[model samples]
Target: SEVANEASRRRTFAIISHPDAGKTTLTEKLLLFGGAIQMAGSVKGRKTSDWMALEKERGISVTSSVMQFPYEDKIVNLLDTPGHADFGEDTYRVLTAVDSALMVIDVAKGVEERTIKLMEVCRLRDTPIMTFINKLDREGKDPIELLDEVETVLGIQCAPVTWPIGMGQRLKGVVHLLTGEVHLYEPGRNFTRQDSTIFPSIDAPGLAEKIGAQMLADLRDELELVQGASHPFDLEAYRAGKQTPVFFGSGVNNFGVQPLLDFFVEHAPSPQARSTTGREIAPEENKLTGFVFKIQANMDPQHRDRVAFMRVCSGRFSAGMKTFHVRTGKEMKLANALTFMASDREIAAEAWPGDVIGIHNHGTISIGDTFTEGEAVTFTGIPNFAPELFRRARLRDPLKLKQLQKGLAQLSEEGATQFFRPLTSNDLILGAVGVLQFDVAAYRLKDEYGVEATFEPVSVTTARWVHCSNEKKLEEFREKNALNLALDAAGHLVYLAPTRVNLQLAQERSPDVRFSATREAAHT
Candidate 1:
């Protein structure tokens, strides 16, 4: 009963957006409101969420960061996902762990390319979504036009919960539609603890003087139009992922961010049921069940630590508890479970459903590996997508070949890059959704593992994991394409396709064999 109560007080969600849409800044502001940090940090300066060296050097998030903080009476598990298209795989897997998503959009750039793709991933699971139109302080699109593009392009009904007053240098503040509280805009005002000036309504006294006559007229007209045209905030529809309640704000200035965080804490769903291989796991279930959705190696390079981030699906977890590792079928003590604020973390004494707890792993846990209190069930939907780009790893020093191999294996295990061992050659082939992953892998190997390596271009264009119910047919297919065959990090057979035509030909020739572009990680 206590476990269920705690689960209900949890709000697990992720923030996603296109590159440079201010998702990281928004995360810091949310943390600031939660009192997790003293002040909000800028992305151009030091970001609270972007912890990796590569992320700092490039000024873009290359990995997903898990942050937990107390907001009001709820425990918020906020996953700050990489917004770059190259890191889609990481973002997609992170989405699988969250109950809902906070979609950040740049007002200047309404709905961009990566936003469309991320929305598709959320739609796959029908994950609830909330929208925050950022950078309103800067000159940007009209609020109504931005909402229209979101509805048309993302195909989600818009419900404007907070409406902006003006744009660019003329920006004033935002009117909370439900509460009728006006948050007056103050440039570079990072602390937002007691900034709101509540009003009876948008037409209440002193509103005209605060924002000027023209802005008040525009706000009233837009609010009327929005109320009439847009779908009203339906909680059921929002929970079902059919509609997204929109908020307008400038993340950098902390304008309109507190309301967004408040709404998220009040409305975001708690840990819900998770579909597993055997049965659906409800958060209220007494048995402890969770799965590893991400792994970060060398978060503390001093200790050479590897942390497997597991989303608690059901029941409660306590430190030193012995649980059955579904993948390995071995009982392991989950000691030193860590809760995080980006790179900083503390040993968690206890964690509830919807909480993302870090288990200090020593190769015993992996992405998608489920752990339970003696239950055989495994959580589902964590997938490894077929990489679009391929490269061959080349070691700089022959004497350090073992170090290079170990580095590649660990990096692949962490999902930084997909590694394949060629059946016909000794070359280790690396696959990635984008070319930037190879650069990150190389950099990590050198910086973290003390292994210098280079990734050279490979002739392979794509890869597919081969499966067949018939063992003989599978072996025959593998033999036929032996030269082009490779084994993934998990030892699953993969067919390396030189071109799309070759993939088509292979599929045509082997009808009994199944070639899948996405492999559910837990299945292997």
Candidate 2:
């Protein structure tokens, strides 16, 4: 009962958006409002959650950051995901760990390509989402139009919890619909909370002076239209991922943020039961179970440490507890467990379901590995997508070959890129979903590992994991395609086809062999 009560107090969620959509700014503001941080930082100026050097220099979230804090008697686990499409895989994995997602949309851009792609991922799990139409301080689309775009493009219904009065230079803040309060906007006051005036209703006399007569009339008109046309806030529909509760705010200026936070904490779900191969694990189960969704190395360059980010699926986790490593069938002591505040961390003595905890790793932990008190079940849903682009990695310095190999191993394990070793040659092929991944890999190699490398375009257009039911048939297939076959980092046989036509021809010829574009990680 104690575990169940603690579990209900946890709210684990991730924030996702397109690049330059103020996702990082919103993360900082949430932390600031939660009293987790003293002040909020701008995206381009020393962001609190974006701790990576590359992220700071590029002014983008290159990797997912885990931050846990206390807000209004609730423990909030906020996962700040990469906004760039190049890091889409990282964002996907982060989504698997969270119970809900907060979608941040740039009002000027509306619904973007990356945002649509991310929404598709969320739809896979039926993950509930809350929308924040950001950048109200800047001129942007009309609220109703933006809401329509979200519905038509993302295919999700929207309910406006808070409505904006005016935008850009004429911006007047937002009116809380549930409570008849108006939060006034102020520039350069993001460090402190915005002051809101509570009125008996929107028709109260003083409201017109706060905003203008024109703005008040417009707000009333829009509210009336929305009340009739928009979907009402049904808890069941929202939890079913059919509708999203929307809020309008300037994340950088901290406008309309507190209300959003309050609504999220009140309505967002706590940790729920998780599905595994054998059974569904409930949060109230007496035994502990968790799965690792991410493994990051070199978080502390001086210490050369590695941390595995695991989502607690059931029961409670205590430091120094020994759990069965489901993948390897070994007992692993989860000592020195840490919880994160962005890159900074401290030893976490206890954790409940819906909390993300970091455990020190030394090459033994990998993505998708499940740990339990004593169970043989493997968690499912974590996936690996085949890279669209392939490149040959070459060391700039011959003397740093060992460093280069080590760097590639760690980076591939981090899911920065996919590494493949050609069966018939000594060449190393690195595959990625986007070209910027290659840039990040090279940058991290030089900065963290002290190894310089260059990636040259490869002739292979795509790669697929090759599998066969019979071991002998798989061996025969590998022998026949020795020239085109490569071994992935896990030593899984992969067919490196030069073109889509070639892949189709090969698949047609090998009826017994299976060529899969996506595969669940090897959890067993």
Candidate 3:
């Protein structure tokens, strides 16, 4: 239906960045701007929205925080992703559901390894981007340098939409481009005040001098471009050449924020305004059809099933509209609808295409299941995080192993905390992202779920066996007696460790099929 592709459909985006580049803060700001949250919740302080003890103590995002913000005519669904490399798997899953990615780069570090890597991932997928070079007020970086780093690393035509007046603790204000005004974020305040003066027409002494000097410097090195130069300068011409506006202010201080919101309204694309699976979108007008991109489950006493979050790709989907789940081959009705912001709630009635809406207990829905009118097509889900690291863990209370496995099955399905594998006949290996996720899982097992668990460190060993040129001889001897032949291509026997460890192995090096020594040995 061309209805969902109509201009009024909402747009959803995810803010992705390297660890600590300020993704969480940006989410808070966006929420605040939308009038969704009355008082912004602190990411580093006692968590108001995200009630995770780990988030409050460690100050790291362990999961994706979804927030709905109303801007202009559309509601923007903001997914705040984890910054840590260990939690990258969870973040990548959230990315598939959103329309655009706001690449938040730390002004100090430029493009880090993870940043560069994810950029490639997004580029390979051809997702459009909006670059937000954060931390302009902090001491570690400068905006200009970091912006350059971001553009280079991403290898995208990162057109500058905002330029700053100064860098680090010195930044006090920014020149607003959208409305041709000067926004000064009071150095120690919570919001930016619009100075009632036209920009590039400054006659206010020190400010005029500062503007001229900087514009001259920019003109000289083409740090900026200028045309139709007059006595003072033509800011309009300079803007036309660059199509970028420079803004300044501190994120923490809440400076220059009004203009940011105004800019988003003017520039940020609407759902149908952006690229979509259906090539069109409408406003409360299309037959609902979209994909379920994320699932968050609470392992508490009552809540067990996943909150199957989906994007209505191209239709109007309402409650009780039975849609096909191609992933699990079950046609299910829309269940309890939930729209969340961090921990805040937004009531969702019916969703059109390009909207991020969550239906509860979508048992048949998975990461990529598409709910459509024709063939319920679920898009491809993000690749699961490679479980390169693993650890062997056993339950201190053996009776709880099966229950814990069921719990883990429900939990890990929603988030990328860890993977599991059987090590010994009696022992199970809990492969995790790191020691922290492992410890957290262990603690949750005991304190939250009331299960006692045991974990053993992982071990790595080579598997080698001889290429038995004499298959009949080896089989005959094996059938005759217990003369088991197990060796590598170079005639080397291999042994197995009774534990699983995080080890990097070169799998392509080639080795012969390894054989088990004895039934007792093989059983272990």
Candidate 4:
């Protein structure tokens, strides 16, 4: 376990999952735990941040949220990514400021198709990850079943540290796999303690006796392994590699949330565990470093008014310090320090251990642009989502054309849809996951930007590895033509787009892979 001293490094993570699986809800709980949000900050129903009224009304997230809070001396940045297929682009674009990912899921439903796909995208970039199962209080929802699926389906080394004592209606208490301690929660309060029970046989709904036996066996095995006993804790050994520890909880009732937090703090990777890539400003050989994963412009937004969200890859950044973009070379001034709030925004002023600050007016600094103190450094951005889904967009009012273009360009910074070329009929063609995403975009046009926009249906867009010196990968997958085109371990070409028909590689894949396509479904 002795590795390089990355102790000075800051840990930043993204909370990612499918629609209504409690991604935002988990973010809310994390914020509460981290002290970023006041205790009274409310969820108000939908899985959304405090940014847009339109996003809240539609029960979907149109943009991304970045919130950073202190935990045991190390800072943690949380990026709350969108869940809809339409706004999959939003997820694709803002993945640069992340160090690790939390694959949140619904315990009852198990893993969905989309979650697997997202995990694969991260895996392609070799991004480290963990899983959180929400809604353990629901009947038929077993945390053990969820753990098995993650291990078997995705093939990740999942080491669980806790277990739920019961499920659904009769839910109560949890066993700490690591500490062999049981936790009983009393809701309607801040949920701040783990009550003691001497091997209690609490009542569980349905299969009470069965659950009890399994837990006893678990306790025996866990203790054996802790004491270094061979045959006694073979099951514990299995989970460590051949086996895994399972932690479960319900996010809504706020049950099982604290244990998961305890586990995350004790077991999850720190900035040191998840190392950083090179930065824009560096040593004449290795000195300067910073990351520009996305550009957000909105809400008066600010003059020049764009926020360059970044992660300090190497050197330290003082407030108001100036830095150069090795790529854009535009000098940027630190205007305001800010972090994401499950769905609210928190503003701080200094850049330190873990800062997700929005640098104002980064000229020509597009998504995935890195910053440096003095040298040139480049970081592979996170993987991207394909606009496999497309939607046609048009302005309801022709007079707002200029205003709409400015706003849409900013929206484009945080998503995957790349339909910039105009149509002869003057209908603004756009792409997205489906109807909900299109509607969200339409609402954003009217609500925030003060323009009326209409969206049609989503169609399939064709994309591929695109070798031949003109292709691109997502942020984390950013590779040059030579390295990216190679085949994977299993062979048969390492990377292939959805259909694999249109194949060509690019000289360089942008932080977010951008493609050109004509095959689109018209939505009018």
Q: The CA-based lDDT of model 3 is what?
A: 0.50
Among these predictions, the greatest lDDT belongs to 1
Q: Candidate 3, residues 227-287: lDDT per residue as tens digits? A: 1221122334322222223334445545555565565555555554223333433334445
Per-candidate TM-scores read: 0.82, 0.80, 0.66, 0.66
Q: Estimate every model's Cα lDDT from 0 to 1.
A: 0.80, 0.79, 0.50, 0.52
Ten contiguous residues minimizing lDDT sum, candidate 3: 515-524
Candidate 4 runs further than 4 Å off: 1-9, 37-64, 84-86, 142-144, 185-190, 194-245, 272-288, 301-304, 337-348, 382-384, 391-416, 420-462, 468-524
- Per-residue alpha-carbon lDDT of candidate 4 for residues 88-178, written as tens digits (9 for 90 to 100): 4546544445546677778767778768766666654455565667786777654545655777787775566555655676666566655
Number of clashes in model 1? 0
| lDDT, candidate 2, 269-314, per-residue tens | 9999878776788888888888888765535524356677889988
lDDT of 1 by residue, 174-203 (tens): 888888777788644553665555566876
Error of 2 at 253 (Å): 1.5
Sorted by lDDT (best first), the order is 1, 2, 4, 3
Candidate 1 TM-score over all chains jointly: 0.82
